[PDB]
Design a protein around this ligand. Structure first.
Ligand code: HEC
Length: 108
């Protein structure tokens, strides 16, 4: 167990300032640069259709669990070299933890 639930709220504001530019959470939500994250958890990587992931991403074949999501969140490229996703990553866990809190609710 290496994830403590946080502020859904704060997670929610971190997403906008940080993943909105390229993602949408809404079920019925459209893809933009990155894909629509509706129902990511318990889901493997490179699987939203209508979406063109790198070969890197497909291959990775990560199961989207709260805990995976933190590691990837840490440093994307380092987690999945090849991914087109342009994101440096959230160094602090507190931050990481909050947003995962956000995704958890919102992606349900
Ligand atoms: C545009 C500058 C992006 C921002 C900001 C964030 N992400 Fe992203 N994301 C982007 C791309 C181009 C892709 C696909 C990469 C590929 O190589 O095809 C992604 C993908 C993801 C995934 C994985 C998806 C899966 O297997 O279904 C996740 C979980 C994800 N993105 C989440 C995410 C979050 C939470 C972000 C803010 C903290 C974020 N991304 C930023 C592009 C961009």
């Amino acid at each position: 167990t290496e994830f403590k639930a946080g502020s859904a709220k704060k997670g929610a504001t971190l997403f906008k300032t940080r993943c909105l530019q390229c993602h949408t959470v809404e079920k019925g939500g459209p893809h933009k640069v990155g894909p629509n994250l509706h129902g990511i958890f318990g889901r493997h990587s490179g699987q939203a259709e209508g979406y063109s992931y790198t070969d890197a991403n497909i291959k990775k074949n990560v199961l989207w669990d709260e805990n995976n999501m933190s590691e990837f969140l840490t440093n994307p490229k380092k987690y999945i070299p090849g991914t087109k996703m342009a994101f440096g990553g959230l160094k602090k866990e507190k931050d990481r933890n909050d947003l995962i809190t956000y995704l958890k609710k919102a992606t349900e």
